[PDB]
């Protein structure tokens, strides 16, 4: 990815990312945008065209009016964790919402990167019309969905395997290489998806 392309992707994200009102960690918000800028520009442009917003938050997701209905609700795949949406730092699908400072694995989640995983859900649902539930991806998921760990979550829900694989592909060169070694059909699928 050349400098001009990274800059173009940051420019696209400038029309997608929404910052919280009040005090927040500006440097970490910027770092989150920079990580999102590694996503293929085709996906970012489609998010922009669909007026999908990536909402960065300084507090709990359920403190936002549009997610208050999820208070006390246990997310799909979080059964038995003892956590509810009140405790979850990122959400993706028809919208995207992300708590600043919770990007890394272990910050209330075990995704390789919070913002990439959550934004992958929106790309899957909005941009690619639920490709993770297509017959093609289900066949790939059936073979490789248990090779990235967390098999009772990633190995059970194809949309979650898609989102986490997407995060591996786009976070950095190391995670990209790990995905190719663990899940070669998934890697080739994502490679071809971006053409």
């Amino acid at each position: 990815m050349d400098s001009t392309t990274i800059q173009q992707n940051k420019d696209t994200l400038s029309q997608i990312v929404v910052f919280p009102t009040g005090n927040y960690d500006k440097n970490e918000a910027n770092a989150m945008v920079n990580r999102l800028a590694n996503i293929d520009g085709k996906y970012l442009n489609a998010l922009k065209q669909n007026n999908l917003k990536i909402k960065l938050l300084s507090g709990k997701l359920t403190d936002e009016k549009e997610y208050a209905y999820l208070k006390g609700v246990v997310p799909k795949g979080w059964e038995g964790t003892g956590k509810t949406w009140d405790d979850v730092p990122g959400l993706g699908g028809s919208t995207v919402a992300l708590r600043i400072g919770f990007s890394n694995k272990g910050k209330g989640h075990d995704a390789i990167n919070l913002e990439l995983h959550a934004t992958a859900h929106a790309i899957d649902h909005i941009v690619l019309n639920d490709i993770s539930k297509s017959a093609q991806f289900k066949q790939i998921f059936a073979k490789e969905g248990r090779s990235l760990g967390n098999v009772n979550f990633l190995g059970v829900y194809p949309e979650e395997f898609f989102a986490e694989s997407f995060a591996y592909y786009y976070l950095n060169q190391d995670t990209n290489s790990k995905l190719k070694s663990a899940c070669p059909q998934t890697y080739s699928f994502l490679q071809n998806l971006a053409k």
Partner: peptide
């Protein structure tokens, strides 16, 4: 649609 990260 709403989807969470990995627990």
């Amino acid at each position: 649609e709403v989807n969470a990260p990995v627990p």
